[PDB]
Structure formats: structure tokens, C-alpha cells
Specification:
The structure is a homodimer.
Chain A lengths: L13 E7 L3 H4 L5 H20 L3 E7 L6 H4 L4 H9 L8 E6 L2 E6 L21 E3 L4 E3 L2 H12 L9 H6 L2 E2 L13 E4 L7 H7 L1 H9 L3 E5 L18 H13 L15 E5 L1 E3 L4 E3 L2 E5 L14 E4 L2 E4 L2 H8 L3 H13 L7 E4 L1 H10 L2 H9 L6 E6 L2 H5 L7 E8 L5 E7 L7 H20 L7 E7 L15 H16 L4 H22 L8 E6 L5 H15 L7 E5 L2 H10 L3 E4 H4 L9 E4 L12 H9 L6 E5 L21 E4 L7 H16 L15 H11 L4 E5 L4 H18 L6 E5 L5 H14 L2 E2 L9 E5 L8 E7 L6 H5 L2 E8 L1
Parallel strand pairs in A: 1-2, 7-11, 8-9, 16-17, 19-20, 21-25, 21-26, 22-23, 22-24, 24-25, 27-32, 28-30, 28-31, 29-30, 31-32
Antiparallel strand pairs in A: 2-4, 3-4, 5-6, 9-13, 10-13, 11-12, 14-15, 17-18, 18-19
Helix pairs in contact in A: 11-16, 11-17, 15-16, 17-18, 22-23, 24-25
Bound molecules: magnesium ion (3 copies) and zinc ion (2 copies).
The site of one zinc ion (ZN) has 5 residues of chain B, from loops.
The structure holds two RNA strands.
GO molecular function, one term (chain B): RNA endonuclease activity
InterPro entries (chain B): P-loop_NTPase, Poxin-SLFN/SLFN_N, Schlafen, Schlafen_AlbA_2_dom, Schlafen_AlbA_2_dom_sf, SLFN_GTPase-like
Protein name (chain B): Protein SLFN14
RNA sequence: AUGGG
RNA sequence: CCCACUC
């Protein structure tokens, strides 16, 4: 994407302007001021394009060989242009430096802060004119923006007797117009040197001024102080040609429309005949412009962007479009504080897993970095298998890894370690990676400061300079940059993205539980309904903690009752409250129990007693809590519950938000829900499949989900499937994932052992644990029935060649591989 | 409060600027620039003060006696100053008219729209500076505001210029014409001495560079250096004394105003030293260095160039005041509906509102209708709004010499305030009317939020029977009149009057509708609910709307919906509107309701289990199918001395508290809150302590501030029966004069045995100048009954007569706007 | 012929 | 000198 530019390989868009004279004394002295104006304009449009296109560097060549910036300054008209381009301070966006015979102007990206008008893009001139009293004022960016917002939500005696001059036809010589110019009246006189091109150049800024503000009459052929009518000789210009010229000129004036009818600008052009002693003398031309509905331009706006490495001018429609233009930003401070703290205790390498893998694979890398970063009292280094891939651009096999250094009083450095020293693509790779990383930090993270990324290449067995303003001055800039990094990684998919998404979901669960806990004081018996992918177990744990906090009771007096033993073990590892299985709850003695929470009441079996009646008798000796969590889409046991009929299941809620899966997993869940609703099954009643809405599910999905991967393969063999699993596992472990991330689940339990053996061979070509091993550092290989209520970040679903996709997707967070 | 101004009695603040020359050519051809600048400046300060202080009219005397505005124009320098004061449009705020030898400038009130930045006031020049590259730019109003919010929100390069310049102070000895190797940048500025005057020009120039230094990055300023040569020439021995030193500038720089978002309040720091110049190792002169460190907050070169009106004088704004006024409800949501249902902008005829006050006026005076009809004629559209005193409506003055006021609003016409006088011999009417118009206009802007140009022209009419404004001050289309009437609705909803009372009642109707819409969600989430209601929540309307929702959500006839209450009067009230059965609890028992599907029960607190179990009966009816058993409870309004059949409060789930819904006045709500606090401090016996814990004062504060409206609550004590009757008769007569109706008044006696007596004692006092029982609310009569029989119903005006205590809550609950507690 | 640097 | 309205 970037050019070659071997002389200065800056990781930015570089605009070369040519040869420019510099120096205050030098600039004050020229002949041929056209060259001076052109040299000012070129740099100004370059600055405008760079402000509107994400920043960059401007390259100029110095004519004076003995020139020195510290002794000659910069100029005087250039500073005036800078003031007229950046009214609220030009220092925050421009810097100047001198590399020998080169003058470099560093331009920051234009982004308004939280204390400013919402002015999205920078312009020299709005080029849409307004009328104040009698002068046509070219509006500024802010004034034009206010006018656009005005039209989006959609003294006088001079206007009289102007239409009277419009009405009459015959004129003698030297009529003293009794009315002077006003908002609706303005006049000029002809120029005998050139008439038609002067009218070309002069009409637009009055036609636009009238069309914008009320409506007016342009009179041409009238003097200022004498207030008479003069005109030019008839032989100089034919009136019909002039009228046609005026019509075609007005038709070419750019226009924007907030309405739908798209009317053209309505004007009336008339020619008169100024006589002299009953002899034809000349013409006076009158143009009446009514108040137009929407904004009328005189020329294209003085705004520029960068397209195809060229400084181009924005059109009217484009200019108006970009002129008028999440929970990540709410929790980014906490995420940065917990994941990327800014301390003074040496330098910390992140993430721990990938760094451990890289340092175990190569011992010299740790010392090589600890010597390269030195001298640095404090800082942060973030590693990645491919920072280009993490951003989402490219993946190079010749690169071992990339590191990012962020520290105070220092710029940001991008280290690129190469497996092979003589590979000729390292420098371009590092430069482009720095460019795309900075661009993503700006356009996504929201970093409005000044920062630079320096590419550096490094070999296993083994200089650009910026303005000092482009270095992280203090710790606050470090925090802002790291929060932008948090946003950028949460927007992408990688190992760090997965870990930070887990932290994000943990933060969101607390808010959801706090909101849910308000119903504790409003209800005693409740029937909570949960969508596919809600994580009812974490909600239940937080609810038990809140019950213990609100009702001042011993944790032993709160009973969690579930169906599966693995979920019970997970829960007793989590909460101090008592947790029993359904079979233990029955044929059991519970006399000192006040509050009961039931999860997985879907699969409760009534073939051993009435569990609902037992719970009601326990909570109704005092009136205790009897909250039931139900997800009617996850019924596996072929038995009815002790549940009362759906009409008697009141009061109830419908937890819609709580989707802590990837976007594609949520898509699969939504499609499966639609399929189930279209063709209801036997064990799911129509009444219960009516409280879940697809629109609400989509709204909850595009408020908490994060990017991930779902991939389905069909018509595969056992050995091929095992090899696929082994290869994907190997790639993940290389990228930094842990064994306690992955879980392989087979639909049929009897297919476990076989699928185990083919696994042990596959990983041999390139240790599995039961369902009570999800907290250990091993890959879990079990069945869907035995894995109910648990979850892991990467899930491999094995099933022979069908509404059970949802049971697989409910067990996964970011990666779901469905192999048939 | 306005001045006399017999010549032009505008209802505006008029600023007389003096004897001023006008003309596009008359100002050009004129010497004595000290006069041109003075007149331009005076007019500009007047415009700025008017813009920042509500608008008005500037009056000037034109120099040329042949001057005509349409011929001679306004000028060029004045127009440029107008452009520099209002960057985005001046026609929106300034109009000009000529009356004889007077030029009047009509100045609108600067009010930022929903588009522009929050620039609250207009500024000619902020006078706080910035650095840029090598410059000192006076910040515009917008950029200055940006800087204030930013500051309160708390091989060679350019930076090399600081080096080789920070070491200039260390150069204690200096030799004549030494070259300087650094050029001007963001950290250095040097100026050349002036031979004629040295001190005054230094003092003029220092503040506006010290401001930029202290406001952008710091730095230092030299004096004695040339721009074209970088000399060290400086002054001489005989023209500069050692008096000009650090101490001398220690007062000039300290004269600069400084604001501070900080608490340390540090004065600006500067150090001055003298570098001697040596022409051939001989002293020749001195050059000056002043080092200015950057400031934590803003530093002002001068006082800001902003003006307001104080004591009818154009008064300059200091830095603190300027920065303070630069950085500084559901009525606006419902005003569109209120205006379209109360003031429909149509063309069928002229609408005289309010109707009750108009009826009283037209019955007290038969000829008022014809005089009014002739006053606006010829006309086709508009609304005429009548009042007993429009000055008193906006809360300023009540006059016994004025019969009534009329406000005419029409398309292609300005607002006209008519003042009707009983006796023309009264001389002071004119001023009154004028002032009133002024006040009304201001209320339409500060309170009503109106932005466009409007003028209120006062006229004086007698029973036994010209100000000029710009054309732009007349209403243009129907949308303009709609916005003006919406502003009027907003203004009146914050005042106390008849029109305010009716608007508040309809406001309460809309609020109740939205509250019931919110409450209808719980019909999808539960079957039996225990709704706990604050005092003054108007639960009966909620119940009516709830059955309206049940009839649709469950597609069933109104027959299978039941209302259960305690009083027969409220049963009739409810059965008046609702199509469902509405029977009291006594007849609900000893009866059979087999077709009933859903039951809504009101006044559940005073239900008595002396005839069985009503709760079990309702439960068994609703539990044959699972029906709805919503129960509304008000624990603070227990009257009956009976034990309910309700389940214990620990078994009254699921439950919800309707905290919001306060549809009374601010003072009535305050009385309610005080009674709540008194009750909670000393709990009674008929209410369980557990139930007196679901109610918090803060939520009541929020609801009252969000929904209540200003009203009247007066308590009189130590009175006899005749005095109370006289008070009631006088208040009723005065209210009927104001335009009220008997259907808004309820006189309630605590003890029922006091009723008959309080009838006769009343009827005498009223006869000095027909009643209804509590079951007469729907009739057009004044009800005189007890609060026990009026429980559950409401009236706008309540007279609570009580013998000489926790029962003020009932009286406050039956009242909407006016409460008069007589003991 | 009008203001800001 | 630079810039803005301006015949
Ligand atoms: Mg003009
Ligand atoms: Mg002209
Ligand atoms: Mg300078
Ligand atoms: Zn349009
Ligand atoms: Zn401070």
C-alpha cells in the first residue's frame, strides 16, 4: 500500500510538494508572486488532505543551500494560511523539521475533542455564500455547518421598488435609483475590458448569497456613488447570448438537497434597454433569485482528501456527507487498568501465554529484548504472532513474532523478529504494519494525541526522527494509547482479543446481575426464562451472593439444585452456598433451608417424586425465594417435570441480554431458534415458544457479542477429522492459546473412545480429561449430555450426519468448529 | 420599571446613544476620526448590551436633516463591526427603522438555536490571547469558549528555538551589536524600542504578549532587538532610567485579570534582568528581558470587550462575570399536544378562550362581545385569550382599576395586548399596559423558550366606547403561531391562574395516560399483583386504563372484568366511564359472580372482613384458567377501624411501588411530604411498621419535581364559624370573578355531624353577597360533604374545615391545585 | 475606500 | 508587509 521512499521510509502517507523557498526574509522578497501563491497553496492543500486523511508528512526541497530553520524562520504568508486553516490553534496539528536539504511538515489527523463543535472535516473555504446586510460573506466551516443543520430541520422598503425596477422595461439615461443596496438589492457595473468572463467570475458569490438568504436582485449596469444606470454599448455583446450564458452558468452551480423533490434553482433573468435622448445606449441586466429550499454552492468546497496517493478536491455532495457524518468505551478504563497497568516496576511482557511459548521455543529472545529495550526504567511490551494479522491485514510466515514497546518520554517501537535474515521483505512489512496499526488506533480506538510508531527489524543472532511532540510525555498519554489499543483488540480476533473479551464479559455480567437483583425485593417466587446463550450459571451465582447480602442469612441456607453432576461440582467450587443434584435433593432431608435457586429445571425428572411440591413446601413453612431458571430450547431428558402448567408459571421474566458468545455463534443460535419455532417439536409446547423474539435477540447480539470464528465441515472421515482437530490445535497453541481453552464434544457418548484413539494418533503425527476437568489444564473430551452447564472458548463438535447445533453452540464462546 | 419615554413608549429597554452621523457616503467623507470611532464604538456597545440583556431599541439622532435611510444607506464601518460581532448572520438580530430625525435599531435577544455552539452571550473581543507560530491572536468568542472548557476540563526543528534563547539570561555581559542566532518562534518575541516614548508603548505592548506566553507555552520577550538584523541596540543612558525594572512591571503585569479553575490561586511569575550594552567596552544602554512562564488557567490582557445592561446603563463585563455567563421537564415534551388540543390553529373563526372566564365576562358585561368583535375586525384567524389581569398571570402585579386583559394572536399580525378600563378618568393605564407587554415578551423568552421575533403592542379600551415595528416582527405562517402558542403554554404552566389550572389538568391527563401505558406491561409478567401507591397518585385513573388494557390484551367482554371498591360514590364514579361491572365490596360479597374472569380491587386498605373473606372469594373466582387479581393499596389512608382479610405483608408478593404519579401542586405535595415524615417519625397502630418502609422521601422529591405544578396552599387558624363562612364566600366569589366554575370547588368537613350546621352558616354568608352531596361530583354544583364520603375523588379547589393530628393527608389528596385549611 | 497579524 | 469586505 505504501510507496517505496527509500530516502525516508516513514510509516505514513508522504506528500512531496517539490521545491519551496523558505525563510521570512527570503519569502518577503520575490518577483513573480504567482509562484509564491502557488507554493503557499500547494502546501496548504497538502495539509488539508493530510488532516482529512489521517495525518502524514509533507516533503519540500529547500532552494537556499545555506538555509537554516533556526535562523530564517518559515515565512509570513504560510503562517497566515495556517491561521486561516486552523482557527483554534495550528500548533496541535502542525510541526516543522529540517533534514539537511529537506523541509518536513508533520501533520496530525483532524479529530475534534470532547470540548469543541462537531466539525468533522477541515476546509479552507465553505464556498457557500450568505448575505449579512449588503456584502456577500463566504461562510466558514462552523457557519456552513450551522446552516446545514438549519436546513436539515426543514429595511424591507429596499426589496420593494427593486421589483418595481424589475417590472419596468424602457429606461432613459441616468436614472438616480432612489434605493441603495440591501439584503435583497446589490449592483455592479460593467467592465469594458471583459464582460462575459467577469460576469462568470462575479455572479456565483451573489447568486448563492441570495439563494441562501431570502431572495434578491442582481443588477448589472448601475454605479455606486452616482446611483445611475450606465450599461455597455449594444455592439459589445448580444443580449440573447448573455441570457443563455447566464442560464447555463446558473444551471452549473453546485447544489445540495435535504428534500426529496429535487427542484432546480428558480431564477428570472431579464434584459432592459437604457436609452439616451430617445436613442439606444446600453443594457442593464436584472437577475431575481428567490429563496431556495436548500444549500446552493458557488464552486466546489475548498476541502481536500487523499485518493490513490493524490491530493484531490472534495465535491459538494461528498463534502456535505462527511460534514454531517458502545459498552467498550464505558469499560475501556477498567480493562486498561486491569490488563495494562502503568507502573514503574521495570517492563512487563504481555500476554503471558504467548510470551512463555516464544521464550521456551527461543531462549535468546528474552535477553535480546531485555537488552534492546534498555535503557528504559518502565514500559510495556506486547507480543503477537502477527500484529498485521491481529489488525487484520496480512500474515507472514517469515516473521517469528512482533513486539510493541510503549513507554513514557519515548515513542512507540514496532520490533519485527525475522526467522531468516536475508528475506528481502522485512522492512516493507514492518513499515506497513506500523502504518496500519497507527491508522487503526486512530480510526477505531479514538486516540486524538500525537504518537509515532518506529519500525525496526531484528534477527535472532543479532534512523527516522520525529518531532519531540510525537512522544508519550506522561502516564496519561500512555493510558489513552492503551485504551485505544484495548478498543482495537476488542474489535478484532486474536489471542489477546479472546482474553480481553473474556474480561469484558466478566464486567458485563456484574451489571446484568445488579439489574436482575432488584427483583429480589419485588418477588418471592419467580420463573426466569433464558434465551440460548445467556450464562444462567454466573447469573445464579451472583444472585446467591446478593441473596446472602440482602437477606442476612448463612450461606448454608441457600440451596442450588441442578440436574448434572459436573455443573454441581463447578458450582460448589464457585460459591460457598450448598449445591446438590436433583437426585440428592430428593430422598434428602432439608429442614434448615430458606432460599432455593433451581437451574436446569428443563430436564428435571418427576419419576422419583414431585420436586416442585417439595421446593414449595420448603419455601412455604416465612416466605422464601423460589427462583427457577428455564431455557425451553435445551430439553434432553425424555420425561416431564413436576412443573405446573405454563399458564400457572407466574410471575416471570425473559432475560434477553446476556449473550456472551461470538457474533457468528449468535447467528447460528438465531437460525436454529427460527427453525425450531417454525416447526415446533413434541416436547416443546407452543405457549413456551412465544416469549422469545428474534428482534430482541438480534438487539442483544449487536450489543454484547464480539468477533469470532464458526466453521462447519461436512462429509468427512474419522482420521481426517482427527487430523483437522490436531492441526487447528497446533495453530492455536502456536498463536498462544492454552490447552484449557479447547474442548471436543461428541454427540453420542459411545463414540468417545474411538474418537479418542484417532485423536492420539493425529497429535502423534503432528492428554484428554473427563467432564470434571474443565478447570484443569487439559483438553476436555466428553459428550453434550455430560457437558451441560459448562463452557470453553474453543469447541469442536463431532456428530455423524438435526436440531442439535444449538446445544453445541451454547458451549462455545469464540470458536466453534462443527465437523461431521 | 420602564422609563417614561413619552415620545416613543415602546415596551422595550431603549438605549439613547446620542447625536450620530449616518450614511454610506457621509461617514466616508468625515475628518476627526476620534468621533467616527467613538460613535461606532458607542453603537456597538449598545448592541452588545441589548443582545446580552433581552433585546430592545437603540435610538439615535441623525446628523443630516436631508438623510433618508432608503437613499443614503447605513454605512460601511458600522456594517463591518456588525459583521465582526455576529459572524453567522446579523439580519436575524438587527433591524433598522427611521422615524423623522430618529434612527431606531431593533435588537433581538441572542438565544442560540439547537444547531450552533452553546455560545450563551455575544462578545466583541474576548481579550485573552494565544501564541500560534510567531503572533498573538485575540481569541474569538467560540475559540475562547473552547479554551475555557479545555482548561476547566482538568538538523533543526521548532523546539530548538527555546535552546540558544533560554541561555540569553545567563549572558550577564553583552557587547554592542552582537548577532542573535535565533529567529522569532513560539517561545521568543523581540520588539524594537521607540525613540519618542519608551514607557507608555512598553506598557501598551506587554499585556497582549504576556497573555499569549502564559496561555500557550510560556517563553520570554526581549526589548532591544531588531527584526531585520537581530541587533542588541536597546535604549540609551539618558532616555531610560533604572526605574523600569522587575518591580515596575510587577504592577503592570499584575494589572492583568486572571480567572482560575484551580484552588491554589498562583499569581503569574516573571523575572526581569538588565543586559548592559557595551559600545567599545563602554556602557551605552540596556536591553530588557521578561520571562513569562505558562499559566495554569486563563490570563486576560484586559477586561473582556463585552457589555450588558445594568441600571439602564451599558455596563462592561469583568473577566470573572464574562467567563461565568459564557460557561453557565416534561412540559416541553407534551407542549405540542397541549397546544394542538387547547389552542387549535385554524381559520374557521376567532376563538375566545378560556370559555368559563369569557362566559363570566360576557354575562357581567353584555356589550363586551361586540366591542371585542369590532376591535380585531377586519380579521379571519387567531385566538383571543382573556384574563382578569395578564400582569398578574405572569406574576408581577394585580390592579383593581383594570377590568380584563385580552391577548390577540393572529397570522400576518403582531401580538396585541388589550387593557380594558372601567373608568377612562384613570390616568395610569398606559404605563401599566406597556409594562405588562414588556413582561409578557420576556416571559415568552426566558421561560417559554421562544426564539423568533415577536412584538406585543398595548392598546387601551374603555367600556363606554401608534407604535411602529418592523414587518419581520409580525407572525408569518401557522407554524410561527404554533410555536408562539407553545411558548405561551410553557409560560402559563409555570404560573398560577385559571388557564394554568386547566392546562395543568390536561397535562396530568397525558401524564396519567403514559404512566398507565408503562404499567400495562406487568399484565404480561404476572397474574396477581400488589400495587403500593403513594398519596396523591390518582390510582383510579390507573385502574380504569388497566381494565381498558385487559379488555384488549385478553380479548374478552367488559362483563368478565370486575371493579371492587368500598364507597358507593366511587362506585358510581367508576361505572360512569368504564363498561365493566363496578360494584362495591359489600355487594361483591353476599353475591355470585360466575362469569367473572378478572378482578381489580381499589381502596383495599379499608376493606372489612366482618362479612367473610373477600380475598379468598376473589382468589377462588380467579383460580377455577388463571385470572388477574391486581390489588391497589394506599397504606397511608386508612379510615375504617376494621381488620382486613388481606394476607400478612410478608406474603403480599409479587408487588410494585408506583412512586411517581404525583398529580397535585408543589405546595400540596410539600404538605403531603411533611405529613409522610410526621407519620413515619411516630408510626400509628392501624398501619403495620413493615408497610411503612416501602416509601422514601427522595423518590417523592424526584416525582414532585418532575410532575407537580405551582399552586396555592393556605392554612388559617383560630377562627369562628362565621369567619370561616365569610372566608369561604369571599374566596368563592373572587374565584368566580377570576373565571372559575362551581364544579371545581369542594368544601369538606372532617366530622359529618358538622355538615348541616356548616350548610346554614355558609348559606347566610353567601347570601350576604345550591349545594350537592359527595355523590354529586359529576354535577355542576359545589359539594359540601365529608372527606369520608369524598374519599377516592378529587377537586381542583378544596376548603378543608376542621375543628381545632395526622389527617391533613386526606384533604391534600382530594385537592389538585388549591387547598385552604381553615381551623 | 474597512478591520486582525 | 499579510489578510478580509470593497466599488
Ligand atoms: Mg456590496
Ligand atoms: Mg455591488
Ligand atoms: Mg511577531
Ligand atoms: Zn431542497
Ligand atoms: Zn489555575
Amino acid at each position: 500500500s505504501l510507496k517505496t521512499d527509500t530516502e525516508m521510509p516513514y510509516p505514513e502517507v508522504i506528500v512531496d510538494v517539490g521545491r519551496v523557498i523558505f525563510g521570512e526574509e527570503n519569502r518577503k522578497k520575490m518577483t513573480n508572486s504567482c509562484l509564491k501563491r502557488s507554493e503557499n497553496s500547494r502546501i496548504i492543500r497538502a495539509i488539508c488532505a493530510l488532516l482529512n486523511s489521517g495525518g502524514g508528512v509533507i516533503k519540500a526541497e529547500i532552494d537556499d543551500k545555506t538555509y537554516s530553520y533556526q535562523c530564517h524562520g518559515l515565512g509570513q504568508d504560510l503562517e497566515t494560511s495556517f491561521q486561516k486553516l486552523l482557527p483554534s490553534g495550528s500548533q496541535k496539528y502542525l510541526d516543522y523539521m529540517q533534514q539537511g536539504h529537506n523541509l518536513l511538515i508533520f501533520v496530525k489527523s483532524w479529530s475534534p475533542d470532547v470540548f469543541s463543535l462537531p466539525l468533522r472535516i477541515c476546509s479552507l473555504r465553505s464556498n457557500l455564500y450568505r448575505r449579512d446586510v449588503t456584502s456577500a460573506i463566504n461562510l466558514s466551516a462552523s457557519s456552513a455547518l450551522e446552516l446545514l443543520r438549519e436546513k436539515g430541520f426543514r429595511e424591507e422598503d429596499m426589496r420593494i421598488l427593486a421589483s418595481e425596477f424589475f417590472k419596468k422595461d424602457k429606461l432613459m439615461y441616468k436614472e438616480k435609483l432612489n434605493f441603495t443596496e440591501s439584503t435583497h438589492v446589490e449592483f455592479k457595473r460593467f467592465t469594458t475590458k471583459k464582460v462575459i468572463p467577469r460576469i462568470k467570475e462575479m455572479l456565483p458569490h451573489y447568486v448563492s448569497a441570495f439563494a441562501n438568504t431570502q431572495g434578491g436582485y442582481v443588477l448589472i449596469g448601475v454605479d455606486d456613488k452616482s446611483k445611475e444606470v450606465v450599461g455597455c454599448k449594444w455592439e459589445k455583446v448580444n443580449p440573447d447570448l448573455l441570457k443563455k450564458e447566464i442560464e447555463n452558468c446558473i444551471e452549473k452551480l453546485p447544489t445540495f438537497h435535504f428534500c426529496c423533490e429535487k427542484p432546480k434553482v428558480n431564477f428570472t433573468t431579464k434584459i432592459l434597454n437604457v436609452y439616451q435622448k430617445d436613442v439606444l445606449d446600453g443594457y442593464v441586466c436584472v437577475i431575481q433569485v428567490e429563496p431556495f429550499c436548500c444549500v446552493v454552492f458557488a464552486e466546489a468546497p475548498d476541502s481536500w482528501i487523499m485518493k490513490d496517493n493524490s491530493v484531490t478536491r472534495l465535491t459538494a455532495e461528498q463534502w456535505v456527507v462527511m460534514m454531517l457524518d458502545i459498552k467498550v468505551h464505558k469499560f475501556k478504563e477498567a480493562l486498561q487498568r486491569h490488563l495494562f497497568p502503568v507502573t514503574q516496576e521495570e517492563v512487563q511482557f504481555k500476554p503471558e501465554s504467548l510470551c512463555k511459548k516464544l521464550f521456551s521455543d527461543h531462549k535468546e529472545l528474552e535477553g535480546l529484548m531485555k537488552t534492546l529495550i534498555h535503557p528504559c526504567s518502565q514500559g510495556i511490551v506486547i507480543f503477537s504472532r502477527s500484529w498485521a494479522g491481529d489488525v487484520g491485514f496480512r500474515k507472514e510466515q517469515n516473521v517469528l513474532c512482533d513486539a510493541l514497546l510503549i513507554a513514557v518520554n519515548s515513542p512507540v517501537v514496532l520490533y519485527t523478529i525475522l526467522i531468516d535474515p536475508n528475506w528481502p521483505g522485512g522492512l516493507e512489512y514492518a513499515r506497513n504494519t506500523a502504518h496500519q496499526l497507527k491508522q487503526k488506533l486512530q480510526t477505531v480506538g479514538g486516540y486524538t494525541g500525537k504518537v509515532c510508531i518506529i519500525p525496526r527489524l531484528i534477527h535472532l543472532s543479532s534512523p527516522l526522527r520525529y518531532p519531540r511532540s510525537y512522544r508519550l510525555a506522561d502516564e496519561e498519554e500512555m493510558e489513552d494509547l492503551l485504551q485505544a489499543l484495548v478498543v482495537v483488540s476488542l474489535s478484532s480476533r486474536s489471542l489477546l482479543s479472546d482474553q480481553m473479551g473474556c474480561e469484558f464479559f466478566n464486567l458485563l455480567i456484574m451489571e446484568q446481575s445488579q439489574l436482575l437483583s432488584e427483583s429480589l425485593q419485588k418477588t418471592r417466587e419467580l420463573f426466569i426464562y433464558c434465551f440460548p446463550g445467556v450464562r444462567k450459571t454466573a447469573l445464579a451465582i451472583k444472585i446467591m451472593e446478593k441473596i446472602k447480602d440482602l437477606f442476612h442469612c448463612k450461606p448454608k441456607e441457600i440451596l442450588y439444585v441442578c440436574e448434572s453432576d459436573s455443573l454441581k461440582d463447578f458450582v460448589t467450587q464457585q460459591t460457598t452456598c450448598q449445591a446438590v443434584t436433583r437426585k440428592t435433593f430428593m430422598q434428602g432431608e432439608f429442614l434448615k433451608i430458606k432460599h432455593i435457586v433451581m437451574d436446569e429445571t428443563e430436564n428435571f425428572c418427576s419419576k422419583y417424586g414431585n420436586w416442585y411440591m417439595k421446593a414449595k413446601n420448603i419455601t412455604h413453612p416465612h416466605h422464601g425465594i423460589l427462583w427457577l431458571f428455564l431455557d425451553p430450547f435445551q430439553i434432553h431428558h425424555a420425561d416431564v417435570n413436576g412443573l405446573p402448567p405454563p399458564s400457572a408459571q407466574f410471575p416471570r421474566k425473559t432475560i434477553t441480554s446476556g449473550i456472551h458468545c461470538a457474533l457468528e455463534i449468535a447467528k447460528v443460535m438465531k437460525e436454529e431458534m427460527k427453525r425450531i419455532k417454525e416447526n415446533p417439536p413434541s416436547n416443546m409446547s407452543p405457549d413456551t415458544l412465544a416469549l422469545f423474539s428474534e428482534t430482541a435477540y438480534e438487539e442483544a447480539t449487536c450489543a454484547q457479542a464480539l468477533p469470532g470464528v464458526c466453521e462447519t465441515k461436512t462429509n468427512l472421515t474419522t482420521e481426517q477429522i482427527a487430523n483437522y482437530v490436531a492441526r487447528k490445535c497446533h495453530s492455536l497453541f502456536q498463536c498462544g492459546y492454552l490447552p484449557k481453552d479447547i474442548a471436543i464434544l461428541c454427540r453420542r457418548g459411545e463414540d468417545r473412545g474411538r474418537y479418542r484413539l484417532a485423536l492420539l494418533k493425529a497429535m502423534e503425527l503432528i492428554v484428554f480429561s473427563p467432564a470434571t476437568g474443565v478447570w484443569g489444564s487439559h483438553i476436555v473430551l466428553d459428550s453434550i449430555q455430560q457437558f451441560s452447564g459448562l463452557e470453553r472458548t474453543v469447541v469442536f463438535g463431532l456428530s455423524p450426519e438435526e436440531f442439535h447445533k444449538l446445544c453445541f453452540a451454547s458451549r462455545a464462546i469464540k470458536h466453534l468448529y462443527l465437523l461431521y
